[PDB]
Ligand binder design. Sequence first.
Ligand SMILES: *[Se]c1ccccc1C(=O)Nc1ccccc1
Ligand SMILES: *[Se]c1ccccc1C(=O)Nc1ccccc1
Ligand SMILES: [Zn+2]
Ligand SMILES: [Zn+2]
Lengths: 153, 152
Amino acid sequence: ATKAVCVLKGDGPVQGIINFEQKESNGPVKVWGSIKGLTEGLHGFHVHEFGDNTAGCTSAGPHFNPLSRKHGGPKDEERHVGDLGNVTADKDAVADVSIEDSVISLSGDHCIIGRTLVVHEKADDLGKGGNEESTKTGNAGSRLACGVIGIAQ
Amino acid sequence: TKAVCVLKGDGPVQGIINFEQKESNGPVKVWGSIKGLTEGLHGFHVHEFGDNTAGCTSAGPHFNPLSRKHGGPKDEERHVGDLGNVTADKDAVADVSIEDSVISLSGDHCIIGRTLVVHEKADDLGKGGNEESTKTGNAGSRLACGVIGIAQ
Ligand SMILES: *[Se]c1ccccc1C(=O)Nc1ccccc1
Ligand SMILES: *[Se]c1ccccc1C(=O)Nc1ccccc1
Ligand SMILES: [Zn+2]
Ligand SMILES: [Zn+2]
């Protein structure tokens, strides 16, 4: 198995720990952990292209999109590799994250190690929104917290 | 290929370190700045895990894919992660300028997704007079660290 990990940090504190595990290179990636300090509701949850936090989460650039597709939800064929949809915070300000994804990888061209995981201000409309930005960012708004995805023990 | 690392920790130490590799079989240029350091040498290493779960301790040992002993960057007998020391002046600033032929941004020596750490004390480059010299270089605690990420 390959394992990766990401510490999310941002103002609030929006603070999170996200684990990734992939049993085989041809297999799905399990994504799990917790994020605290979130407003109740949906928050867009993406892998961004650069593992660059030089000037904060903005330095990470756009959604990780190695196949040059449009933005979508994780269940869509038409999606960025980085498109992991939304995490949900309850009134406790905590998102318990539990995702399985077949498009991200911890090996190959779709590998997310060394990239940036970001949790966003607003809901990702999964590219079903009523404007042009829907097909690029999903209108998930500002970057609340982020971290670089690293190799784990 | 380009990579970058933001060094942060619990205390005054913070830095930005850039990596550039023109060809996969070529050296990696390492440059940037670290502030908040005491005057003198500070061990400067790539550690095995890009894991900052509980701060710099979670990064584990020096990145050592070839199972060698600790050394300096100009030694054959070194960990891949062994980048020696950075030097802070009385200004508390280390200006970093390294070229290294053993680290890579491609292949089995790749350091992307691992942790860069700047240490409390000098790395003795494995020439110290104790057992720990051949493992850690006696560079002491981890002042600041970050995960090495892919850059634009
Ligand atoms: Se995984 C991983 C993590 C960081 C940087 C590169 C990779 C990787 O697997 N790279 C690679 C292999 C094959 C094709 C493109 C990229
Ligand atoms: Se580079 C890098 C950084 C972290 C993890 C993996 C790699 C990498 O490119 N490894 C590798 C992948 C594919 C082919 C050769 C080597
Ligand atoms: Zn997207
Ligand atoms: Zn070492």
